[PDB]
Amino acid sequence: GRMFAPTKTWRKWHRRVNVHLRRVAVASALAATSVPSLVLARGHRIETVP
Amino acid sequence: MTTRFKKNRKKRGHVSAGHGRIGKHRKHPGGRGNAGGMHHHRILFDKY
Amino acid sequence: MVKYSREANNPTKSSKAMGRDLRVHFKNTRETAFAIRKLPLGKAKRYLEDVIAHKQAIPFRRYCGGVGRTAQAKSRHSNGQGRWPAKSARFILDLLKNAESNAEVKGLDVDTLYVSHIQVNQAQKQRRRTYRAHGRINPYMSSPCHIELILSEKEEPVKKEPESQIAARKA
Amino acid sequence: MVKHNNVIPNGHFKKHWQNYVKTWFNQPARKQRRRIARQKKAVKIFPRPTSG
Amino acid sequence: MKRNPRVTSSRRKCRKAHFTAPSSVRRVLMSAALSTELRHKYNVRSIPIRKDDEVQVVRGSYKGREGKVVQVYRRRWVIHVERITREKVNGSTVNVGIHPSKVVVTKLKLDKDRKAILDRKASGRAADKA
Amino acid sequence: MGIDLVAGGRNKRTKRVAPKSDDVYLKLLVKLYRFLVRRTKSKFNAVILKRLFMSKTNRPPLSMRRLSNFMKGKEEKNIAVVVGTITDDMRIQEVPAMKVTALRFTETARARIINAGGECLTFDQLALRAPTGENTILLRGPKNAREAVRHFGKAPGVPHSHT
RNA sequence: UACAGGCGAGAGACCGAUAGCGAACAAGUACCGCGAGGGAAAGAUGAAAAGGACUUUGAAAAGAGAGUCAAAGAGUGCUUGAAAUUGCCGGGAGGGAAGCGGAUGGGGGCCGGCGAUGCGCCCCGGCCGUAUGCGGAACGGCUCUUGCUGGUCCGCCGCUCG
RNA sequence: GUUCGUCUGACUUGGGUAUAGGGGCGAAAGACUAAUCGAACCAUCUAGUAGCUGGUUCCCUCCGAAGUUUCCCUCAGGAU
RNA sequence: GGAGGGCGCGGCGGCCGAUGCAAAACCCGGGGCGCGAGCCCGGGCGGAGCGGCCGUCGGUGCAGAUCUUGGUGGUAGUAGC
RNA sequence: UACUAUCCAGCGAAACCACAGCCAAGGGAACGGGCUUGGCGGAAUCAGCGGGGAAAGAAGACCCUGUUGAGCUUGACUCUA
RNA sequence: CGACUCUCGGCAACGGAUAUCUCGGCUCUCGCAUCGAUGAAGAACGUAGCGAAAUGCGAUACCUGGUGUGAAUUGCAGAA
């Protein structure tokens, strides 16, 4: 039989983003490469440059 | 105890107005007119 | 033998047999196994012939609810329930004949010993359905059964040999 | 059945909306079809603008 | 998955086509790796085989057998080669199927239409290389 | 045991460093206050700690107006501790300077306050130079006002006879 | 601008054989009903059938040997083969005794565990060598042009000892 | 099964043929109309509704009720 | 009845591990951990892929429902034929 | 007196089952197989039996209630061929 | 005192769950226009060497011409 719930086309697979909110996140991401600790923490193997 | 047609809250937002009471507006119709002809917007927007 | 059960012996020293999907009462044919286990080949064969004739009864130690009762109980002295199912006795007799022959294939003597181990299991249940009153239908079904029979050459001489200082007098 | 200082809600739903529907499922594809149509129009005209 | 507006891409579809193989599908999947001598003549690594070829088992447990390709089977995509066999209980010998990828081509019958395949693919390999 | 005894066990629990504190910068800042408060005599810095704990949905934006109006020569240009943020909906050119410190400033505020005078100071600096927490007012900020006391919903919350 | 059909395609934080469509398989099939209509159950040996010749028992079906297989603890009940139930057997218990099936205590029955075996000292055997000079370097506080104080280490030679 | 009503007529019974669902037919019992009749069966609308009965799925922690007030076609239930 | 803090399963982005010299699964009056939810490990069976951890998400955990579907008892080798 | 039952050989269901099954009285959802207190306390059982299991079959057909229906009636409400 | 009643393990039988598979379903998205008295949609009954079925086809009957590919089809037989 059917079940009254189990999905059926309604469910939003679109959540809206705020551009000002998004801007902060993008900006933060650049800064994360200039601190070596986060790069190591994420699990990058690096023998990298001076 | 529930059967969700009691505590769920009945079905429809009437009986809260119907014979029960609290909230909203009471004593309803005021003026009427204007229709979809005479319609929108008289603006007030501050100069400050 | 199949994907095999409790043999516990040596395979060369033992014989194995199975009959498969014989239609017999599951309840009757086990009781035959219990009542006549370990006894020599000729004596066991004769006992089964006796059951058919009604010279010897099989004690029905288990099973009640008004189950058929002792014309004679015979072995084990008295015992309240007893029946002498002829057909199931015949089927195990045929299996016994096969087991004797199987021993020869091993290179064991036909002369060899007695039934060490028997199991009886319900192989499946065969379908058929029979009509009943009030427009309902309720099944009448038979059970095919697999029965295994083990003859073991170890059992008699191991007990006999280190009876000394007292004890022995048997075979 | 409000238990709030809300006005009791005015829907708009107002029919079986499951029967009707309308989805923005088509919307992600939708812009692309207009855009590729514009590219095709440029090919059709060849020189001269003719945006409209 | 990976790129391109094209007809073909679907994990199910790839399986569906190659198992039941229509004739063009059979021939392209009948492409079996050449031996090294032949690779430097026709300048290709693999070509579709035949029945009057001779083909040597490299890959399997059965390795070291050689024989002519007796038959090729569509329905379950397999090829059958002579002398790669298993014995039935009575003593009958029945061929064991081998995939054309596993087996390596010892010898070619050129033909005329099969010969055309060699020329076009060779031209292909010339263009990229130089 | 008692009902009296149960009364002690059912006591308060306002207490919370907020249910979720997402902001790492907020979270480290309250640790700095936590360390200094128990190592200093300052009642004032202890008050700051509570206002930066429980909620951000309670921290009030404060306009340049009224900030200016209570430092009117009866506070000689001290430091204004603003819990939430400065907002810029005024022009008077305010006071001719003032040192304003806050948790957050609007981008407009950063330009506007410093180009009126003083300096937009961060709360990190407030902690640094005044763990003692003196010569300081927690300036103001309201949310209890005309709009949104119990004035919610659709049609507010009333004069009061019936509602 | 539309698109749950048709045809030909691309995909999914889809489903994984009681799920997914009614149908993965001969499915709108078999079957049910007078009819309108209702409508299942049902996938998997293995790389390859190499699907058990032959011998023997049995009326035959089967069994027992054997052959085959990497594996028959894979033999078209076929990959894995759970619970329930059933059989065998073993253990406990006992045929003078009353049952909520457990908890609590003791004994049996069953089984895993239990510093590599420690320290001070001296003798022999074994190996290495500091300080200081040499020779090559990653370091420090810092300064940050630039400067001064502090390095340790390894290579391994010299000179004295351990 | 026994006992028994009728058995030359308002008789018995077949085939062909007519009448179909608020309809038929009825020497009338609401009887009967394909094991179905105080409104047949089938599919659909329909995943219809039901203050009422049943069931409602992993753990631990801390706090911990009430069957009362008011209104109600309300007294098996809501609002408050 | 609320709130709080966890556990287990399936799949997804990350990250790390494990494997035919034996994975997962299943069995185990075998050991050990956690108050528990559960977890861990051994032995047996087995033969090809899987688990832990950090995020994400659900068709996410069962004893019932005169439960649904499949299997199997006692009844009973009894009523009976 | 027949045909059963019974007893045999063969064949072989179902209903039903929380777990089961020795009494007395007591209290208790106010009438216990179980609890409490006394009496007791056959293994293993068959043919019988109709006290009991408030045995089983049937969401009591009655009776009340539901803002639940439907058949019918009419001087109901409201429409109409 | 065998037995019985009970329990468990080990090995099994029962059963088809579980795991792991999946030429399938499911849902979304894209492209496409294109039935018929010129005999359709749908049915029936036949035709394969050996066929019950599905699939294919129609007395020109598991197919024909033409064309592409270029040697298989296979369970066995068979044409060469």
Automatic annotation (TrEMBL), chain F:
Task: Outline the extent of the Large ribosomal subunit protein uL15/eL18 domain.
Answer: 2-163
One Pfam family assigned to this protein is Ribosomal_L18
Indicate yes or no for the key word Ribosomal protein. yes
Superkingdom, natural source: Eukaryota
Q: Which residues form a coiled coil?
A: none
List the GO molecular function terms. structural constituent of ribosome
Keyword vocabulary terms for this entry: Ribonucleoprotein, Ribosomal protein
List the record's Gene Ontology CC terms alphabetically. ribonucleoprotein complex; ribosome
> Which GO biological process categories is it annotated with?
translation
Check the record and name the PANTHER family matching this protein. Answer: 60S RIBOSOMAL PROTEIN L18, OS05G0155100 PROTEIN
Q: What family is it from?
A: Belongs to the eukaryotic ribosomal protein eL18 family.
Record-given protein name: Ribosomal protein L18
